[PDB]
Every structure is written in structure tokens, then in C-alpha cells.
């Protein structure tokens, strides 16, 4: 559901993946971290060029997930910020 066509279901899925990443630190989840960060930028390049209030809410949800993901795991964070500059 993070790799789904609809924007809102993608936002909910990337929230779920971000929340799994920020939460409990078992080893055999760390690969999802990589998936997580790519998911954000993928969703971002879907919801940047749309200019609709639903897409604006998707921007809100995605950027809140970006902040929380960079907050929980700082070693992803640098990759996080550089991807953001690309869509800037």
C-alpha cells in the first residue's frame, strides 16, 4: 500500500512504514529503513506537481513522516535531507 497508485493510501502506508521504523529496534527490520526513505521521495514526486487540496494534505502527511523518520533514526537523516533538496 506504500507502492499503490492512489495518493491517500500511499500516505497511510508510508505513515505505517515510518512508524515501524521509528518504533522498536529489532535487527531484522533494518532493511525496511531503506524502503522507507525511498517511499517518501517516491510519494513526494507524485504529490508535488498536482496543486489540489487532497495533494496538499498528502504533502502534509508525507512531510510529517519525513520529520519523524529523520528524528527517530538520525543515520538515515542525511540521505533524507538531500532527497528533499532535489524536490526543492
Amino acid at each position: 500500500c506504500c507502492y499503490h497508485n492512489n495518493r491517500g493510501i500511499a500516505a497511510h502506508g508510508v505513515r505505517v512504514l515510518t512508524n515501524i521504523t521509528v518504533s522498536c529496534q529489532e535487527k531484522d527490520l533494518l532493511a525496511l529503513e531503506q524502503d522507507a526513505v525511498f517511499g517518501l521521495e517516491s510519494l513526494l514526486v507524485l504529490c508535488s506537481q498536482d496543486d489540489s487540496p487532497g495533494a496538499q494534505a498528502t504533502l502534509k502527511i508525507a512531510l510529517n513522516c519525513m520529520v519523524k523518520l529523520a528524528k527517530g533514526r538520525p543515520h538515515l537523516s542525511q540521505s533524507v535531507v538531500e532527497t528533499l533538496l532535489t524536490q526543492l
Binding site: 502534509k60 512531510l63 510529517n64
Partner: protein, 32 residues
């Protein structure tokens, strides 16, 4: 549903003093 919690500049977070400041300050629209 807000990204930045310590944002000074939201849609409507402007107190009264800033409200009359904006009212008398946006009208001129020129800066040197």
C-alpha cells in the same frame, strides 16, 4: 496535521498587535 510545530507563520496565529501591524503595513507595498 502541521509539519512544523514551532512555526511562527501559520494561517492564523497572528495576535491583535500583529493584526493592526499587518493592516497598516501591507497597504503601502513599497520598500527602499
Amino acid at each position: 496535521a502541521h509539519v512544523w510545530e514551532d512555526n511562527w507563520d501559520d494561517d492564523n496565529v497572528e495576535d491583535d498587535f500583529s493584526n493592526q501591524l499587518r493592516a497598516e503595513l501591507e497597504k503601502h507595498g513599497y520598500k527602499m
